[PDB]
Amino acid sequence: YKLICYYTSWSQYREGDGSCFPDAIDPFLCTHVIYSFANISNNEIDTWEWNDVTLYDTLNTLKNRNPNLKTLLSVGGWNFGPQRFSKIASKTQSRRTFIKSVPPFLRTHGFDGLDLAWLYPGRRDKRHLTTLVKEMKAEFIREAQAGTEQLLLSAAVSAGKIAIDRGYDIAQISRHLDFISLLTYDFHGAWRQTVGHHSPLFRGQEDASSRFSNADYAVSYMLRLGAPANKLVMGIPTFGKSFTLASSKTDVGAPVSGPGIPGQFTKEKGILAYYEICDFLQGATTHRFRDQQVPYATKGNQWVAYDDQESVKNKARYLKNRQLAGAMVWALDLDDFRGTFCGQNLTFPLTSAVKDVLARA
Numbered sequence: 001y002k003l004i005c006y007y008t009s010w011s012q013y014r015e016g017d018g019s020c021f022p023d024a025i026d027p028f029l030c031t032h033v034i035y036s037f038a039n040i041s042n043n044e045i046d047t048w049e050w051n052d053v054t055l056y057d058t059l060n061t062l063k064n065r066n067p068n069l070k071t072l073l074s075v076g077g078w079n080f081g082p083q084r085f086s087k088i089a090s091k092t093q094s095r096r097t098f099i100k101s102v103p104p105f106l107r108t109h110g111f112d113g114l115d116l117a118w119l120y121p122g123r124r125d126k127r128h129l130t131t132l133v134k135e136m137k138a139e140f141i142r143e144a145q146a147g148t149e150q151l152l153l154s155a156a157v158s159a160g161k162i163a164i165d166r167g168y169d170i171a172q173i174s175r176h177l178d179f180i181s182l183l184t185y186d187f188h189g190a191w192r193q194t195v196g197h198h199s200p201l202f203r204g205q206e207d208a209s210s211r212f213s214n215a216d217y218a219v220s221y222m223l224r225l226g227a228p229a230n231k232l233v234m235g236i237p238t239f240g241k242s243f244t245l246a247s248s249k250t251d252v253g254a255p256v257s258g259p260g261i262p263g264q265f266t267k268e269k270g271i272l273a274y275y276e277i278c279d280f281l282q283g284a285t286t287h288r289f290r291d292q293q294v295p296y297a298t299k300g301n302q303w304v305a306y307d308d309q310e311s312v313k314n315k316a317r318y319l320k321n322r323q324l325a326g327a328m329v330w331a332l333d334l335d336d337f338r339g340t341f342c343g344q345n346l347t348f349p350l351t352s353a354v355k356d357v358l359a360r361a
């Protein structure tokens with residue numbers, strides 16, 4: 001059982017305790033850590049922050065304590081135009097150039113693999129996505145000839161029925177990637193003038209206009225399209241989505257007037273880090289969609305949908321009963337990495353909850 005954990009660069013700039021560096025990652029916690037979003041320039045992989053080579057270095061030193069730990073660099077991200085990916089993948093010259101530039105970048109900075117986070121390819125991109133992965137992997141194989149451990153290749157895919165069918169030839173890329181991370185946590189977000197939970201586990205017999213909007217359907221589905229379970233990794237959130245209530249309605253379907261107010265540390269409407277939620281929770285009313293197995297809090301005119309140790313251990317058992325390759329946790333830096341915000345004196349509480357479940361049978 002794999003536990004792939006993302007670490008975002010931009011989490012270093014956060015003020016107060018919010019600040020986080022590779023520096024603060026428990027080396028034995030995850031099996032795979034991923035540095036979040038490298039860039040591409042002149043059709044070549046490349047850095048993003050002014051200090052990535054230092055942080056890269058910082059992260060890969062963890063491997064000196066846990067020789068089994070593995071690391072990867074992710075490409076793309078949300079602040080990276082898909083157009084950009086698209087343009088690079090459509091021209092066999094741009095693509096082959098980008099590709100041939102990856103292995104040496106990684107070898108240089110100590111990485112064991114590359115992670116493609118092309119955030120949402122379109123109908124006109126399937127054909128090339130399949131290529132990129134193919135050739136990319138063909139390169140990675142041609143280079144192990146150099147007498148060094150073959151590089152890993154993974155992709156972060158969406159979990160939206162329509163998004164998938166639109167730009168993913170799962171059947172194909174499934175035999176080239178080393179593993180696939182399903183983004184099972186973006187089944188909502190304010191552009192729905194109503195409240196709702198973004199990372200539910202089950203459809204929950206009560207509302208289906210979004211039957212295909214839950215981890216369960218997402219997995220059943222990928223499996224049918226052809227992706228073997230031993231390469232599928234379920235994504236688990238470590239943040240929560242927030243909305244500003246438009247009325248005194250808290251119950252299912254309440255009207256929303258816009259996203260939630262920013263967190264004292266993550267400063268960003270719509271989102272809250274777990275350790276911020278921990279602070280939010282005091283004086284909040286906690287409820288739980290029993291049907292879907294996930295909680296949600298409420299305070300004043302703030303409605304927050306999030307995952308707690310329970311819901312998280314819950315999903316963890318799920319991937320297990322479906323015999324998947326493992327779990328994926330978005331944002332090590334959004335969890336309580338200091339272990340000083342959420343009651344219990346435990347560091348990385350959520351990520352740990354998953355690890356303990358997977359650690360069993």
Ligand SMILES: *[C@@H]1O[C@H](CO)[C@@H](O[C@@H]2O[C@H](CO)[C@@H](O)[C@H](O)[C@H]2NC(C)=O)[C@H](O)[C@H]1NC(C)=O
Pocket residue numbers: 039040041042047048049
């Ligand atoms: C990622 O690399 C791209 C491409 O080199 C950078 O985008 C360039 O921005 C430069 C300088 O800011 C502009 O003059 C070019 O017009 C941009 N080209 C494109 C395709 O946008 C981008 O700034 C880099 N991003 C980071 C974070 O380093």
